[PDB]
Write a protein that binds this ligand. Structure first.
Ligand SMILES: [Zn+2]
Ligand SMILES: [Zn+2]
Lengths: 160, 159
């Protein structure tokens, strides 16, 4: 049962790539419409959805339309999907990035981070339509694989 | 919006996640997929090739909690390696080769991902959002893996 405000997903507010009409459903039940033109989204929604009031658009498995978010480069943390059902948590310090969490020990991730629009989530905001459930993040005494080498959790990504 | 001929080529195979998928084919048809045990039951009008072929066209109008889990035994795939750039990968046995790219000097990861990370596999789109694919350049262009450069047609180095 969707409930106003308490059920609401934290939506995206920012630059969009592509123009047209976006459509989504907030977990509260609200249908949110985004009118996108020149990188900017105008939000239409009901009074009962936190997204309507914040001017945000909750991206999820029920999002449709031609546009995609282009997230701001000043993010702190991101969820990066590195295998079919596995995630690494990326922490951005300056221009450097660190794997600070993972869903399973010895998860293999690419040696460099992609552009932020390839992240599943940035600072708690979902960016992708399909995304597997994130398992609880392991942040202690775990390692990740890059090729043949093992790196300790908190390590910088090999290529930087 | 012409029946059969406007139609997008759709996916048929294993899905992960069970539940109800919905999409709109470019012909205008609404197609529903009921996913149970990784298998999809199609419901659609007889005016769409996807109904007639048992397939499900994944695009910007797809909704539902499931995703394709394609067999690792494709021949060619489209791989989105930058915001608006793609590489074409050709598989031969356990080896992969970059056989096309949308711009010269594209950088790509050294390893191909699992197939569900491809935007297209053998002409079947797998991803909901996907930027338009510019013409694929298949000759006299280079791709980069880290600091190393390779001519089109070359194997990906982490193999
Ligand atoms: Zn809501
Ligand atoms: Zn059709």
């Amino acid at each position: 049962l969707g409930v106003p405000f308490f059920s609401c997903q934290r939506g995206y507010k920012g630059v969009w790539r592509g123009d047209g009409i976006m459509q989504t459903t907030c977990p509260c039940g609200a249908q949110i419409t985004g009118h996108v033109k020149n990188g900017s989204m105008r939000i239409v929604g009901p009074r009962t959805c936190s997204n309507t009031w914040h001017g945000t658009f909750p991206i999820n498995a029920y999002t449709t339309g031609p546009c995609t978010p282009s997230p701001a480069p000043n993010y702190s943390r991101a969820l990066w999907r590195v295998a079919a059902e596995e995630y690494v948590e990326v922490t951005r310090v300056g221009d450097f990035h660190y794997v600070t969490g993972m869903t399973t020990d010895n998860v293999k991730c690419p040696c460099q981070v992609p552009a932020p629009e390839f992240f599943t989530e940035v600072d708690g905001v979902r960016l992708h339509r399909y995304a597997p459930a994130c398992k609880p993040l392991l942040r202690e005494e775990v390692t990740f694989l890059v090729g043949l080498n093992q790196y300790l959790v908190g390590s910088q990504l090999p290529c930087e």
